[PDB]
A and B are shown apart, each in its own frame.
Chain A
Amino acid sequence: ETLRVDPTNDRLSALVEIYRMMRPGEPPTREAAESLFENLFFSEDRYDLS
Chain B
Amino acid sequence: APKKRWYVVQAFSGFEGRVATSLREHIKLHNMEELFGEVMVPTEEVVRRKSERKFFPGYVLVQMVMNDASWHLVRSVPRVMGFIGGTSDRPAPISDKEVDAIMNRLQQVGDKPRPKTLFEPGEMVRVNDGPFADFNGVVEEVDYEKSRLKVSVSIFGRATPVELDFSQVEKA
Contact = CB atoms under 8 A, between A and B. Distances in A.
Question: Chain A, interface size: which category?
Answer: under 10
B104 interface: no
B72 interface: yes
B72 A32 contact: yes
Nearest to A29: B68
B89 interface: yes
Main secondary structure of the interface of B (DSSP, over half): helix
Nearest to B69: A29
A31 B88 CA distance: 19
A25 interface: yes
Contacts of A32: 72
Contact of A25 (B69, B72, B89): B89
A6 interface: no
A20 to B, nearest CB: 11
B135 interface: no
B166 interface: no
Interface in A14-31: 25-27, 29, 31
Nearest to B72: A32
A31 B72 CA distance: 10
Interface of B: 68-69, 71-72, 88-89
